Design a binder for this molecule. Sequence first.
Ligand SMILES: [Mg+2]
Ligand SMILES: [Mg+2]
Ligand SMILES: [Mg+2]
Ligand SMILES: [Mg+2]
Ligand SMILES: [Mg+2]
Ligand SMILES: [Mg+2]
Ligand SMILES: [Mg+2]
Ligand SMILES: [Mg+2]
Ligand SMILES: [Mg+2]
Ligand SMILES: [Mg+2]
Ligand SMILES: [Mg+2]
Ligand SMILES: [Mg+2]
Ligand SMILES: [Mg+2]
Ligand SMILES: [Mg+2]
Ligand SMILES: [Mg+2]
Ligand SMILES: [Mg+2]
Ligand SMILES: [Mg+2]
Ligand SMILES: [Mg+2]
Ligand SMILES: [Mg+2]
Ligand SMILES: [Mg+2]
Ligand SMILES: [Mg+2]
Ligand SMILES: [Mg+2]
Ligand SMILES: [Mg+2]
Ligand SMILES: [Mg+2]
Ligand SMILES: [Mg+2]
Ligand SMILES: [Mg+2]
Ligand SMILES: [Mg+2]
Ligand SMILES: [Mg+2]
Ligand SMILES: [Mg+2]
Ligand SMILES: [Mg+2]
Ligand SMILES: [Mg+2]
Ligand SMILES: [Mg+2]
Ligand SMILES: [Mg+2]
Ligand SMILES: [Mg+2]
Ligand SMILES: [Mg+2]
Ligand SMILES: [Mg+2]
Ligand SMILES: [Mg+2]
Ligand SMILES: [Mg+2]
Ligand SMILES: [Mg+2]
Ligand SMILES: [Mg+2]
Ligand SMILES: [Mg+2]
Ligand SMILES: [Mg+2]
Ligand SMILES: [Mg+2]
Ligand SMILES: [Mg+2]
Ligand SMILES: [Mg+2]
Ligand SMILES: [Mg+2]
Ligand SMILES: [Mg+2]
Ligand SMILES: [Mg+2]
Ligand SMILES: [Mg+2]
Ligand SMILES: [Mg+2]
Ligand SMILES: [Mg+2]
Ligand SMILES: [Mg+2]
Ligand SMILES: [Mg+2]
Ligand SMILES: [Mg+2]
Ligand SMILES: [Mg+2]
Ligand SMILES: [Mg+2]
Ligand SMILES: [Mg+2]
Ligand SMILES: [Mg+2]
Ligand SMILES: [Mg+2]
Ligand SMILES: [Mg+2]
Ligand SMILES: [Mg+2]
Ligand SMILES: [Mg+2]
Ligand SMILES: [Mg+2]
Ligand SMILES: [Mg+2]
Ligand SMILES: [Mg+2]
Ligand SMILES: [Mg+2]
Ligand SMILES: [Mg+2]
Ligand SMILES: [Mg+2]
Ligand SMILES: [Mg+2]
Ligand SMILES: [Mg+2]
Ligand SMILES: [Mg+2]
Ligand SMILES: [Mg+2]
Ligand SMILES: [Mg+2]
Ligand SMILES: [Mg+2]
Ligand SMILES: [Mg+2]
Ligand SMILES: [Mg+2]
Ligand SMILES: [Mg+2]
Ligand SMILES: [Mg+2]
Ligand SMILES: [Mg+2]
Ligand SMILES: [Mg+2]
Ligand SMILES: [Mg+2]
Ligand SMILES: [Mg+2]
Ligand SMILES: [Mg+2]
Ligand SMILES: [Mg+2]
Ligand SMILES: [Mg+2]
Ligand SMILES: [Mg+2]
Ligand SMILES: [Mg+2]
Ligand SMILES: [Mg+2]
Ligand SMILES: [Mg+2]
Ligand SMILES: [Mg+2]
Ligand SMILES: [Mg+2]
Ligand SMILES: [Mg+2]
Ligand SMILES: [Mg+2]
Ligand SMILES: [Mg+2]
Ligand SMILES: [Mg+2]
Ligand SMILES: [Mg+2]
Ligand SMILES: [Mg+2]
Ligand SMILES: [Mg+2]
Ligand SMILES: [Mg+2]
Ligand SMILES: [Mg+2]
Ligand SMILES: [Mg+2]
Ligand SMILES: [Mg+2]
Ligand SMILES: [Mg+2]
Ligand SMILES: [Mg+2]
Ligand SMILES: [Mg+2]
Ligand SMILES: [Mg+2]
Ligand SMILES: [Mg+2]
Ligand SMILES: [Mg+2]
Ligand SMILES: [Mg+2]
Ligand SMILES: [Mg+2]
Ligand SMILES: [Mg+2]
Ligand SMILES: [Mg+2]
Ligand SMILES: [Mg+2]
Ligand SMILES: [Mg+2]
Ligand SMILES: [Mg+2]
Ligand SMILES: [Mg+2]
Ligand SMILES: [Mg+2]
Ligand SMILES: [Mg+2]
Ligand SMILES: [Mg+2]
Ligand SMILES: [Mg+2]
Ligand SMILES: [Mg+2]
Ligand SMILES: [Mg+2]
Ligand SMILES: [Mg+2]
Ligand SMILES: [Mg+2]
Ligand SMILES: [Mg+2]
Ligand SMILES: [Mg+2]
Ligand SMILES: [Mg+2]
Ligand SMILES: [Mg+2]
Ligand SMILES: [Mg+2]
Ligand SMILES: [Mg+2]
Ligand SMILES: [Mg+2]
Ligand SMILES: [Mg+2]
Ligand SMILES: [Mg+2]
Ligand SMILES: [Mg+2]
Ligand SMILES: [Mg+2]
Ligand SMILES: [Mg+2]
Ligand SMILES: [Mg+2]
Ligand SMILES: [Mg+2]
Ligand SMILES: [Mg+2]
Ligand SMILES: [Mg+2]
Ligand SMILES: [Mg+2]
Ligand SMILES: [Mg+2]
Ligand SMILES: [Mg+2]
Ligand SMILES: [Mg+2]
Ligand SMILES: [Mg+2]
Ligand SMILES: [Mg+2]
Ligand SMILES: [Mg+2]
Ligand SMILES: [Mg+2]
Ligand SMILES: [Mg+2]
Ligand SMILES: [Mg+2]
Ligand SMILES: [Mg+2]
Ligand SMILES: [Mg+2]
Ligand SMILES: [Mg+2]
Ligand SMILES: [Mg+2]
Ligand SMILES: [Mg+2]
Ligand SMILES: [Mg+2]
Ligand SMILES: [Mg+2]
Ligand SMILES: [Mg+2]
Ligand SMILES: [Mg+2]
Ligand SMILES: [Mg+2]
Ligand SMILES: [Mg+2]
Ligand SMILES: [Mg+2]
Ligand SMILES: [Mg+2]
Ligand SMILES: [Mg+2]
Ligand SMILES: [Mg+2]
Ligand SMILES: [Mg+2]
Ligand SMILES: [Mg+2]
Ligand SMILES: [Mg+2]
Ligand SMILES: [Mg+2]
Ligand SMILES: [Mg+2]
Ligand SMILES: [Mg+2]
Ligand SMILES: [Mg+2]
Ligand SMILES: [Mg+2]
Ligand SMILES: [Mg+2]
Ligand SMILES: [Mg+2]
Ligand SMILES: [Mg+2]
Ligand SMILES: [Mg+2]
Ligand SMILES: [Mg+2]
Ligand SMILES: [Mg+2]
Ligand SMILES: [Mg+2]
Ligand SMILES: [Mg+2]
Ligand SMILES: [Mg+2]
Ligand SMILES: [Mg+2]
Ligand SMILES: [Mg+2]
Ligand SMILES: [Mg+2]
Ligand SMILES: [Mg+2]
Ligand SMILES: [Mg+2]
Ligand SMILES: [Mg+2]
Ligand SMILES: [Mg+2]
Ligand SMILES: [Mg+2]
Ligand SMILES: [Mg+2]
Ligand SMILES: [Mg+2]
Ligand SMILES: [Mg+2]
Ligand SMILES: [Mg+2]
Ligand SMILES: [Mg+2]
Ligand SMILES: [Mg+2]
Ligand SMILES: [Mg+2]
Ligand SMILES: [Mg+2]
Ligand SMILES: [Mg+2]
Ligand SMILES: [Mg+2]
Ligand SMILES: [Mg+2]
Ligand SMILES: [Mg+2]
Ligand SMILES: [Mg+2]
Ligand SMILES: [Mg+2]
Ligand SMILES: [Mg+2]
Ligand SMILES: [Mg+2]
Ligand SMILES: [Mg+2]
Ligand SMILES: [Mg+2]
Ligand SMILES: [Mg+2]
Ligand SMILES: [Mg+2]
Ligand SMILES: [Mg+2]
Ligand SMILES: [Mg+2]
Ligand SMILES: [Mg+2]
Ligand SMILES: [Mg+2]
Ligand SMILES: [Mg+2]
Ligand SMILES: [Mg+2]
Ligand SMILES: [Zn+2]
Lengths: 97, 70, 107, 95
Amino acid sequence: SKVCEISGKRPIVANSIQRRGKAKREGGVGKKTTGISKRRQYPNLQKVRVRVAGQEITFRVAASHIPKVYELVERAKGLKLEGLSPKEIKKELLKLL
Amino acid sequence: MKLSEVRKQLEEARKLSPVELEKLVREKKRELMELRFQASIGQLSQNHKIRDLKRQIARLLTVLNEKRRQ
Amino acid sequence: MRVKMHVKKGDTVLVASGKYKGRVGKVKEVLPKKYAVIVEGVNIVKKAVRVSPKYPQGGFIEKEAPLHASKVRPICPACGKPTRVRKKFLENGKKIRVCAKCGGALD
Amino acid sequence: MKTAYDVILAPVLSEKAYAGFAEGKYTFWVHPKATKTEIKNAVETAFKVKVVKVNTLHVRGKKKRLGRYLGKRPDRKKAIVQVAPGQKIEALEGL
RNA sequence: AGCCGGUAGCGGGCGUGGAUCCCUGGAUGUCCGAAUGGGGGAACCCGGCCGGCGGGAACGCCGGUCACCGCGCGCGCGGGGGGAACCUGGGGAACUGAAACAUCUCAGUACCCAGAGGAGAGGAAAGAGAAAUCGACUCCCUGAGUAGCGGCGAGCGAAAGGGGACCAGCCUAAACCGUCCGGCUUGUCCGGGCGGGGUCGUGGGGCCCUCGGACCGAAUCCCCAGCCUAGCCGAAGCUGUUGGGAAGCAGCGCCAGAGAGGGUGAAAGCCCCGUAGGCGAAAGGUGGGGGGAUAGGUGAGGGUACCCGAGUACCCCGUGGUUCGUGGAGCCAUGGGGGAAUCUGGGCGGACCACCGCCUAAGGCUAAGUACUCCGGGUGACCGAUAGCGCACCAGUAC
RNA sequence: GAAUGCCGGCAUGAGUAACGAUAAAGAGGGUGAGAAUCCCUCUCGCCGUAAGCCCAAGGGUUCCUACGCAAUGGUCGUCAGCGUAGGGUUAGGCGGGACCUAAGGUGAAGCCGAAAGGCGUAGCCGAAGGGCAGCCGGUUAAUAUUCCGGCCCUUCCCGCAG
RNA sequence: AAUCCGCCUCCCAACAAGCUCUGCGUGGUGGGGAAGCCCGGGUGACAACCCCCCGAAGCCAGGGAGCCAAGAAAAGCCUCUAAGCACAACCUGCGGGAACCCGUACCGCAAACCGACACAGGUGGGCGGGUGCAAGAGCACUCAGGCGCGCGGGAGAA
Ligand SMILES: [Mg+2]
Ligand SMILES: [Mg+2]
Ligand SMILES: [Mg+2]
Ligand SMILES: [Mg+2]
Ligand SMILES: [Mg+2]
Ligand SMILES: [Mg+2]
Ligand SMILES: [Mg+2]
Ligand SMILES: [Mg+2]
Ligand SMILES: [Mg+2]
Ligand SMILES: [Mg+2]
Ligand SMILES: [Mg+2]
Ligand SMILES: [Mg+2]
Ligand SMILES: [Mg+2]
Ligand SMILES: [Mg+2]
Ligand SMILES: [Mg+2]
Ligand SMILES: [Mg+2]
Ligand SMILES: [Mg+2]
Ligand SMILES: [Mg+2]
Ligand SMILES: [Mg+2]
Ligand SMILES: [Mg+2]
Ligand SMILES: [Mg+2]
Ligand SMILES: [Mg+2]
Ligand SMILES: [Mg+2]
Ligand SMILES: [Mg+2]
Ligand SMILES: [Mg+2]
Ligand SMILES: [Mg+2]
Ligand SMILES: [Mg+2]
Ligand SMILES: [Mg+2]
Ligand SMILES: [Mg+2]
Ligand SMILES: [Mg+2]
Ligand SMILES: [Mg+2]
Ligand SMILES: [Mg+2]
Ligand SMILES: [Mg+2]
Ligand SMILES: [Mg+2]
Ligand SMILES: [Mg+2]
Ligand SMILES: [Mg+2]
Ligand SMILES: [Mg+2]
Ligand SMILES: [Mg+2]
Ligand SMILES: [Mg+2]
Ligand SMILES: [Mg+2]
Ligand SMILES: [Mg+2]
Ligand SMILES: [Mg+2]
Ligand SMILES: [Mg+2]
Ligand SMILES: [Mg+2]
Ligand SMILES: [Mg+2]
Ligand SMILES: [Mg+2]
Ligand SMILES: [Mg+2]
Ligand SMILES: [Mg+2]
Ligand SMILES: [Mg+2]
Ligand SMILES: [Mg+2]
Ligand SMILES: [Mg+2]
Ligand SMILES: [Mg+2]
Ligand SMILES: [Mg+2]
Ligand SMILES: [Mg+2]
Ligand SMILES: [Mg+2]
Ligand SMILES: [Mg+2]
Ligand SMILES: [Mg+2]
Ligand SMILES: [Mg+2]
Ligand SMILES: [Mg+2]
Ligand SMILES: [Mg+2]
Ligand SMILES: [Mg+2]
Ligand SMILES: [Mg+2]
Ligand SMILES: [Mg+2]
Ligand SMILES: [Mg+2]
Ligand SMILES: [Mg+2]
Ligand SMILES: [Mg+2]
Ligand SMILES: [Mg+2]
Ligand SMILES: [Mg+2]
Ligand SMILES: [Mg+2]
Ligand SMILES: [Mg+2]
Ligand SMILES: [Mg+2]
Ligand SMILES: [Mg+2]
Ligand SMILES: [Mg+2]
Ligand SMILES: [Mg+2]
Ligand SMILES: [Mg+2]
Ligand SMILES: [Mg+2]
Ligand SMILES: [Mg+2]
Ligand SMILES: [Mg+2]
Ligand SMILES: [Mg+2]
Ligand SMILES: [Mg+2]
Ligand SMILES: [Mg+2]
Ligand SMILES: [Mg+2]
Ligand SMILES: [Mg+2]
Ligand SMILES: [Mg+2]
Ligand SMILES: [Mg+2]
Ligand SMILES: [Mg+2]
Ligand SMILES: [Mg+2]
Ligand SMILES: [Mg+2]
Ligand SMILES: [Mg+2]
Ligand SMILES: [Mg+2]
Ligand SMILES: [Mg+2]
Ligand SMILES: [Mg+2]
Ligand SMILES: [Mg+2]
Ligand SMILES: [Mg+2]
Ligand SMILES: [Mg+2]
Ligand SMILES: [Mg+2]
Ligand SMILES: [Mg+2]
Ligand SMILES: [Mg+2]
Ligand SMILES: [Mg+2]
Ligand SMILES: [Mg+2]
Ligand SMILES: [Mg+2]
Ligand SMILES: [Mg+2]
Ligand SMILES: [Mg+2]
Ligand SMILES: [Mg+2]
Ligand SMILES: [Mg+2]
Ligand SMILES: [Mg+2]
Ligand SMILES: [Mg+2]
Ligand SMILES: [Mg+2]
Ligand SMILES: [Mg+2]
Ligand SMILES: [Mg+2]
Ligand SMILES: [Mg+2]
Ligand SMILES: [Mg+2]
Ligand SMILES: [Mg+2]
Ligand SMILES: [Mg+2]
Ligand SMILES: [Mg+2]
Ligand SMILES: [Mg+2]
Ligand SMILES: [Mg+2]
Ligand SMILES: [Mg+2]
Ligand SMILES: [Mg+2]
Ligand SMILES: [Mg+2]
Ligand SMILES: [Mg+2]
Ligand SMILES: [Mg+2]
Ligand SMILES: [Mg+2]
Ligand SMILES: [Mg+2]
Ligand SMILES: [Mg+2]
Ligand SMILES: [Mg+2]
Ligand SMILES: [Mg+2]
Ligand SMILES: [Mg+2]
Ligand SMILES: [Mg+2]
Ligand SMILES: [Mg+2]
Ligand SMILES: [Mg+2]
Ligand SMILES: [Mg+2]
Ligand SMILES: [Mg+2]
Ligand SMILES: [Mg+2]
Ligand SMILES: [Mg+2]
Ligand SMILES: [Mg+2]
Ligand SMILES: [Mg+2]
Ligand SMILES: [Mg+2]
Ligand SMILES: [Mg+2]
Ligand SMILES: [Mg+2]
Ligand SMILES: [Mg+2]
Ligand SMILES: [Mg+2]
Ligand SMILES: [Mg+2]
Ligand SMILES: [Mg+2]
Ligand SMILES: [Mg+2]
Ligand SMILES: [Mg+2]
Ligand SMILES: [Mg+2]
Ligand SMILES: [Mg+2]
Ligand SMILES: [Mg+2]
Ligand SMILES: [Mg+2]
Ligand SMILES: [Mg+2]
Ligand SMILES: [Mg+2]
Ligand SMILES: [Mg+2]
Ligand SMILES: [Mg+2]
Ligand SMILES: [Mg+2]
Ligand SMILES: [Mg+2]
Ligand SMILES: [Mg+2]
Ligand SMILES: [Mg+2]
Ligand SMILES: [Mg+2]
Ligand SMILES: [Mg+2]
Ligand SMILES: [Mg+2]
Ligand SMILES: [Mg+2]
Ligand SMILES: [Mg+2]
Ligand SMILES: [Mg+2]
Ligand SMILES: [Mg+2]
Ligand SMILES: [Mg+2]
Ligand SMILES: [Mg+2]
Ligand SMILES: [Mg+2]
Ligand SMILES: [Mg+2]
Ligand SMILES: [Mg+2]
Ligand SMILES: [Mg+2]
Ligand SMILES: [Mg+2]
Ligand SMILES: [Mg+2]
Ligand SMILES: [Mg+2]
Ligand SMILES: [Mg+2]
Ligand SMILES: [Mg+2]
Ligand SMILES: [Mg+2]
Ligand SMILES: [Mg+2]
Ligand SMILES: [Mg+2]
Ligand SMILES: [Mg+2]
Ligand SMILES: [Mg+2]
Ligand SMILES: [Mg+2]
Ligand SMILES: [Mg+2]
Ligand SMILES: [Mg+2]
Ligand SMILES: [Mg+2]
Ligand SMILES: [Mg+2]
Ligand SMILES: [Mg+2]
Ligand SMILES: [Mg+2]
Ligand SMILES: [Mg+2]
Ligand SMILES: [Mg+2]
Ligand SMILES: [Mg+2]
Ligand SMILES: [Mg+2]
Ligand SMILES: [Mg+2]
Ligand SMILES: [Mg+2]
Ligand SMILES: [Mg+2]
Ligand SMILES: [Mg+2]
Ligand SMILES: [Mg+2]
Ligand SMILES: [Mg+2]
Ligand SMILES: [Mg+2]
Ligand SMILES: [Mg+2]
Ligand SMILES: [Mg+2]
Ligand SMILES: [Mg+2]
Ligand SMILES: [Mg+2]
Ligand SMILES: [Mg+2]
Ligand SMILES: [Mg+2]
Ligand SMILES: [Mg+2]
Ligand SMILES: [Mg+2]
Ligand SMILES: [Mg+2]
Ligand SMILES: [Mg+2]
Ligand SMILES: [Mg+2]
Ligand SMILES: [Mg+2]
Ligand SMILES: [Mg+2]
Ligand SMILES: [Mg+2]
Ligand SMILES: [Mg+2]
Ligand SMILES: [Mg+2]
Ligand SMILES: [Mg+2]
Ligand SMILES: [Zn+2]
């Protein structure tokens, strides 16, 4: 329920629209709206744990960009990464975005 | 303090060293305390001298500051 | 920035208006913040003074009351006539007041 | 620059302060920020004595008015310094 | 040529050897405050380290320094907080109106929040939309209360085009080349950095052949004009008379690129301050105008089909935006699922299909015309102390 | 000319109700322009698990002295918690800080949330709890475990000896 | 890590002692010191300063017993050891030096605090003497101390 660290996908506000009646295309009188109220659509955030330069790195990422984490790991092979902390490894991977 | 005395005080102050300017400020600050004491017992009819000394001291510290900025 | 004064202490001025109009006298003092001058022997008033160290016996003194600076006009020391003042740039070149009727210096 | 003469402002002029001269206790107005230790040193290098005891108290300014304008006198600080046996501060012996 | 603020006085001083005062720069600038050594009930309290002072080791004082986060190889640079409105983004009501009320309205308003700057946003067509057309964006007029939207109720309400203001266009990613670094799965490798190259819709670029060898020029830097932050010169009236007083009345004059206005004892072109017309910066600020640098900018065929921005386009589901409230509902945006291609690629012209055309998405920047008024000035068929700002006065005070 | 309109002024009620505990007063002397009301003396009455004394909050010079009485004081006022001025608060040992932790607050690590922000073991802050060395007397118009006197004590630094 | 603490075993000591700490008394020494009289001070006075009794809810204290509802933390302190360092360091005695910041006036059951007021209201802790009433902080009187409540004078109806 927050922000994708890879895509920047973020919760958005959407309306919930309750309708009644038969649609005109089916020969009905038409749809009537018995209620419109705000709600939120969340990104499909999940955890992606991954080992890079011998250290466990955790990403909070929308499912749509799960493969983008592994791409960042692949491209990480060309980086002077060993000896660094997880916080510092993470910053490097994200910089390759 | 007349203008001529102020010009002259500045010329002579700008020839002293920082160490000399400090000793002189210290001397004038004891002079200023003595004026204060005489003022508080109503024995200083020439009260303008208190303002004069304080601005003398300010001028000296201003020159002390000149010499130490570069 | 500064109150403009066409007259100073102490040149010779004519008092050209008021009860003392026509009088000539020296400017004893100029009061820029009141835009007023004090002319010797002009605008005399009786002031009450209390019995005091300063004034034993008490009674009254005589004081010169200020005159609006526009009521007064300098007497040119060259031609001896009441004059508006002009400005002249010398060769220094400082600026001086000069008489408008002839051209003499007033200072 | 800070000197002994910035710490010691004036003597305290009162019957209670004068009562102290007879036993070597001299009372000054000192800078409100001044510490007992620095008042000790200030008195010693100004009056050429040895201080063996310092007492201090803050003196709050008196609220005063002039017509419709209520105000305050400045806050002050008093120091009573005890000088070594047999010593004196002739400037205050005054009287 | 006077001066030591409002502020007189007491008591003393200063100034043509140029004071007070006004402008610019500098110095000093206790403590609190983003407050940042640490703590804290703001303006207090308590420390580490280096140096100094005292007889000084205990104690205290003086100077320097010590928060956190971001970025870049312990050190540097940056950030933090504030600002009357104006601006953009992230969120986002209700009364009310519909003479009840729920969709709808009020309104993406009020307000909360983040951010920006003297503006901000937007901006160089995957545009418009029917002109065989136009040619970034912004802003004004108009188109037009039109087209439309709408419990087709109440109401809501475009765009194109035309007239104007201003004017300006650029940098990248990828192919390919070079170089450095490291990865382990040893090289014709893959990855990372840097440099070159390249930037477009008459499609453009790369590579390969063939042909050909100075003019433009910044939005960046430099100089200068001009401007601001003090100022200066500036024409011409005397006499009598009534009056406390002349500027009124009278006599005789004069100036005017100045007869705007305000003062002066009453009603003054010529007494004063000004006005018309002119003049002025060592210093700081500005400089969009002028000049100069620099950055950058630049051919034609033919072949090759190497590149042309991906969890993207595209389709479906849930919504938002638009005049569009599910409507025949396209377009632009996107939370979920599925998921391409590189010009013979792709998006659009209001379902959809064909035809015919328009355009080049998934990287970034970009003056000016526009908004506002804390601040300075100018001007009112604006107020004149119950008015005009809440405050003409020691008011965001007393209370 | 009216809006129980708004602001201000001034009336009526009216010399009326009231003057705030039914613990209570009387006289003499003094001061002074002025005295039921201030000072002094005698007498009387009231409180006395308080209506006396000490401390903490809160208040902030109201404390002491001199000079005052326009207003403040429910009358009066020469008086005063009122006006003007001068003076007055002194600590190694009392209280708090340079010590400790409580709830709670804050918060390296970490977790969460459109933004603002919400949480969070350690740590830190947080007292009227823990801890820690001063008793009695004298002195001032006004301070006193603070000044002084007597007799004691704590910590820190340095040094000596063990 | 530990020689400390915990656990097991043995010996002695153990309701004794020992060591230690606090209270109270005494204690070199320093103070105080009434009525009355006289003008807060002098005198009383070279003051005296002793005996008996009552006696706390306070002190010794971290005391004892009973009970169930089962009754803070951390530092100071002591002990153990680690890096270290063992010419140092710490401990004990003694000596000299050093010892900062803030509060302290005054009101404080009230005329100075909260109630618009010098307001019969509200405001936490300690001391709160004597006699009698069975006791007591109750009640009456009264000590020290503090007051008569900031309008009065008459009259003697409803
Ligand atoms: Mg729904
Ligand atoms: Mg339908
Ligand atoms: Mg049909
Ligand atoms: Mg419908
Ligand atoms: Mg999850
Ligand atoms: Mg997973
Ligand atoms: Mg998806
Ligand atoms: Mg998917
Ligand atoms: Mg000067
Ligand atoms: Mg001038
Ligand atoms: Mg005249
Ligand atoms: Mg005449
Ligand atoms: Mg000049
Ligand atoms: Mg300084
Ligand atoms: Mg005395
Ligand atoms: Mg010192
Ligand atoms: Mg103190
Ligand atoms: Mg003052
Ligand atoms: Mg003054
Ligand atoms: Mg004088
Ligand atoms: Mg004078
Ligand atoms: Mg000059
Ligand atoms: Mg300046
Ligand atoms: Mg200072
Ligand atoms: Mg600060
Ligand atoms: Mg700080
Ligand atoms: Mg802090
Ligand atoms: Mg040091
Ligand atoms: Mg010394
Ligand atoms: Mg030292
Ligand atoms: Mg320092
Ligand atoms: Mg420091
Ligand atoms: Mg911020
Ligand atoms: Mg902020
Ligand atoms: Mg800002
Ligand atoms: Mg918005
Ligand atoms: Mg946001
Ligand atoms: Mg929104
Ligand atoms: Mg908004
Ligand atoms: Mg809501
Ligand atoms: Mg509604
Ligand atoms: Mg409404
Ligand atoms: Mg309406
Ligand atoms: Mg309507
Ligand atoms: Mg309605
Ligand atoms: Mg209605
Ligand atoms: Mg209704
Ligand atoms: Mg409604
Ligand atoms: Mg709306
Ligand atoms: Mg608004
Ligand atoms: Mg901001
Ligand atoms: Mg502009
Ligand atoms: Mg912009
Ligand atoms: Mg932009
Ligand atoms: Mg483009
Ligand atoms: Mg038409
Ligand atoms: Mg709308
Ligand atoms: Mg148009
Ligand atoms: Mg047009
Ligand atoms: Mg224009
Ligand atoms: Mg153009
Ligand atoms: Mg290699
Ligand atoms: Mg690569
Ligand atoms: Mg490379
Ligand atoms: Mg090209
Ligand atoms: Mg091509
Ligand atoms: Mg450019
Ligand atoms: Mg002029
Ligand atoms: Mg003129
Ligand atoms: Mg006449
Ligand atoms: Mg005339
Ligand atoms: Mg005429
Ligand atoms: Mg004109
Ligand atoms: Mg005119
Ligand atoms: Mg005029
Ligand atoms: Mg006329
Ligand atoms: Mg007229
Ligand atoms: Mg005129
Ligand atoms: Mg002009
Ligand atoms: Mg001009
Ligand atoms: Mg070619
Ligand atoms: Mg290809
Ligand atoms: Mg493209
Ligand atoms: Mg991408
Ligand atoms: Mg959709
Ligand atoms: Mg729709
Ligand atoms: Mg809609
Ligand atoms: Mg429809
Ligand atoms: Mg639609
Ligand atoms: Mg289509
Ligand atoms: Mg989506
Ligand atoms: Mg779509
Ligand atoms: Mg095509
Ligand atoms: Mg295609
Ligand atoms: Mg599309
Ligand atoms: Mg489509
Ligand atoms: Mg189209
Ligand atoms: Mg431009
Ligand atoms: Mg701009
Ligand atoms: Mg613009
Ligand atoms: Mg404007
Ligand atoms: Mg203005
Ligand atoms: Mg008018
Ligand atoms: Mg008018
Ligand atoms: Mg008025
Ligand atoms: Mg008004
Ligand atoms: Mg009027
Ligand atoms: Mg108003
Ligand atoms: Mg104003
Ligand atoms: Mg006022
Ligand atoms: Mg009517
Ligand atoms: Mg009425
Ligand atoms: Mg009424
Ligand atoms: Mg009525
Ligand atoms: Mg009314
Ligand atoms: Mg009326
Ligand atoms: Mg009214
Ligand atoms: Mg009225
Ligand atoms: Mg009346
Ligand atoms: Mg009335
Ligand atoms: Mg009557
Ligand atoms: Mg009646
Ligand atoms: Mg009656
Ligand atoms: Mg009555
Ligand atoms: Mg009553
Ligand atoms: Mg009564
Ligand atoms: Mg009498
Ligand atoms: Mg009497
Ligand atoms: Mg009386
Ligand atoms: Mg009387
Ligand atoms: Mg009395
Ligand atoms: Mg009793
Ligand atoms: Mg109060
Ligand atoms: Mg007062
Ligand atoms: Mg007192
Ligand atoms: Mg007082
Ligand atoms: Mg009193
Ligand atoms: Mg008196
Ligand atoms: Mg009175
Ligand atoms: Mg009176
Ligand atoms: Mg009276
Ligand atoms: Mg009264
Ligand atoms: Mg009265
Ligand atoms: Mg009253
Ligand atoms: Mg009197
Ligand atoms: Mg009173
Ligand atoms: Mg008083
Ligand atoms: Mg008076
Ligand atoms: Mg006194
Ligand atoms: Mg002591
Ligand atoms: Mg303490
Ligand atoms: Mg310390
Ligand atoms: Mg602490
Ligand atoms: Mg702590
Ligand atoms: Mg954090
Ligand atoms: Mg928190
Ligand atoms: Mg916690
Ligand atoms: Mg601590
Ligand atoms: Mg603490
Ligand atoms: Mg405590
Ligand atoms: Mg305690
Ligand atoms: Mg203590
Ligand atoms: Mg003791
Ligand atoms: Mg007292
Ligand atoms: Mg005292
Ligand atoms: Mg003592
Ligand atoms: Mg030894
Ligand atoms: Mg172990
Ligand atoms: Mg013992
Ligand atoms: Mg004992
Ligand atoms: Mg004993
Ligand atoms: Mg004795
Ligand atoms: Mg006695
Ligand atoms: Mg006696
Ligand atoms: Mg005796
Ligand atoms: Mg005898
Ligand atoms: Mg005897
Ligand atoms: Mg009990
Ligand atoms: Mg027990
Ligand atoms: Mg139980
Ligand atoms: Mg227990
Ligand atoms: Mg705990
Ligand atoms: Mg601790
Ligand atoms: Mg070792
Ligand atoms: Mg010792
Ligand atoms: Mg300290
Ligand atoms: Mg203090
Ligand atoms: Mg207090
Ligand atoms: Mg005290
Ligand atoms: Mg006291
Ligand atoms: Mg007291
Ligand atoms: Mg009282
Ligand atoms: Mg008391
Ligand atoms: Mg009570
Ligand atoms: Mg009580
Ligand atoms: Mg009381
Ligand atoms: Mg009161
Ligand atoms: Mg009260
Ligand atoms: Mg009363
Ligand atoms: Mg009361
Ligand atoms: Mg009670
Ligand atoms: Mg007793
Ligand atoms: Mg009986
Ligand atoms: Mg009994
Ligand atoms: Mg009984
Ligand atoms: Mg009984
Ligand atoms: Mg009893
Ligand atoms: Mg009872
Ligand atoms: Mg009772
Ligand atoms: Mg009774
Ligand atoms: Mg009794
Ligand atoms: Mg009594
Ligand atoms: Mg009574
Ligand atoms: Mg009475
Ligand atoms: Mg009464
Ligand atoms: Mg009667
Ligand atoms: Zn002349």
